Amino acid sequence: TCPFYKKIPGTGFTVDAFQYGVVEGCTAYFLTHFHSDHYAGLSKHFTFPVYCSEITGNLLKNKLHVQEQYIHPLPLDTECIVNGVKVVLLDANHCPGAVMILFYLPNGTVILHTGDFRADPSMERSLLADQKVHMLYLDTTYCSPEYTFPSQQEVIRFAINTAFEAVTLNPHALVVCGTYSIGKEKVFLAIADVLGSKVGMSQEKYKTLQCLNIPEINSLITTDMCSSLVHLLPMMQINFKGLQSHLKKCGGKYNQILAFRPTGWTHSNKFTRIADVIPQTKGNISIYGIPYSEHSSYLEMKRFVQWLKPQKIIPTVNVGTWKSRSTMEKYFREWKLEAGY
Numbered sequence: 001t002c003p004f005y006k007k008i009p010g011t012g013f014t015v016d017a018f019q020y021g022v023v024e025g026c027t028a029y030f031l032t033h034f035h036s037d038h039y040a041g042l043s044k045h046f047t048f049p050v051y052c053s054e055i056t057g058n059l060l061k062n063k064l065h066v067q068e069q070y071i072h073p074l075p076l077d078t079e080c081i082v083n084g085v086k087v088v089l090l091d092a093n094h095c096p097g098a099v100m101i102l103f104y105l106p107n108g109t110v111i112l113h114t115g116d117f118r119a120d121p122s123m124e125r126s127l128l129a130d131q132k133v134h135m136l137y138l139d140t141t142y143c144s145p146e147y148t149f150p151s152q153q154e155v156i157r158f159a160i161n162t163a164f165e166a167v168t169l170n171p172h173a174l175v176v177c178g179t180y181s182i183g184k185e186k187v188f189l190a191i192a193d194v195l196g197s198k199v200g201m202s203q204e205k206y207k208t209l210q211c212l213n214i215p216e217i218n219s220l221i222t223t224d225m226c227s228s229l230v231h232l233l234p235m236m237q238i239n240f241k242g243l244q245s246h247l248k249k250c251g252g253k254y255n256q257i258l259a260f261r262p263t264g265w266t267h268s269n270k271f272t273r274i275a276d277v278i279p280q281t282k283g284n285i286s287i288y289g290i291p292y293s294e295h296s297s298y299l300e301m302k303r304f305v306q307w308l309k310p311q312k313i314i315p316t317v318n319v320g321t322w323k324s325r326s327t328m329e330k331y332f333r334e335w336k337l338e339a340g341y
């Protein structure tokens with residue numbers, strides 16, 4: 001049974017609700033982005049209308065096999081009518097294809113559903129500038145003041161400088177970057193660009209990247225591993241055993257691995273500056289964990305919400321415990337008393 005925070009009142013609409021069978025009353029199923037917790041349930045046997053971005057629709061067709069007749073892609077930043085209701089899709093600054101959805105209800109209420117997002121001041125100059133929002137369905141992944149991490153640009157600067165220095169010292173070093181979903185592609189693309197290399201990967205990951213409308217992608221990636229000195233591997237292989245086993249497969253071309261694990265937040269964030277990050281090392285293998293986030297920090301979240309001034313907030317993440325729900329409600333009331341709405 002579908003929970004309340006995935007339903008849009010006054011409509012036949014649901015958001016990120018594919019794991020509950022046929023939802024009674026649902027005439028259109030929205031999908032915010034192609035991450036497994038959100039698409040859980042979709043397959044080639046789905047027969048209801050799915051609304052999404054172009055990039056998410058390319059992934060639904062090629063990777064899950066959903067038939068074409070049930071995929072409804074919408075352009076971004078454009079007023080669209082769906083089943084008699086005006087909607088807009090906005091860039092969520094999450095992974096490729098990720099959107100927020102503005103719903104203009106027949107009774108005059110306006111609802112923003114963030115999906116998953118990383119709030120940014122540039123959102124204050126989108127179509128959200130133009131009118132009031134009554135209800136906010138909010139990605140609360142990092143809604144606590146301990147969740148701190150740097151800008152994506154600082155993190156990429158660290159990764160590029162780390163890789164360029166290691167390979168310039170040792171032209172026989174290989175760089176490896178872990179992945180388990182779409183998102184975070186700037187990590188491996190920026191490193192391969194500084195090294196003058198294409199990125200090598202499996203056929204399955206190449207297929208996924210070919211769905212993402214990245215300009216000039218054919219110049220950036222390949223399935224020919226031997227030609228490449230930046231390789232992608234599944235995240236589960238990013239450990240000393242997995243990486244040893246990978247170096248054997250390269251036929252004595254390389255004598256050192258430098259590997260990156262993009263994570264979300266980790267408690268090493270509470271003490272260490274990005275500058276000061278050190279790897280885990282065994283022998284000719286070193287592994288860096290780098291805090292590249294595609295969700296809002298506490299501070300970015302609070303600024304967005306204090307600017308938007310919603311009448312009501314419904315969290316979509318951390319909703320399963322009384323303590324998490326209570327904690328989030330306290331911060332929403334602080335923010336409202338501080339800013340005066």
Ligand code: NI
Binds near residue numbers: 033035094116
């Ligand atoms: Ni996500």
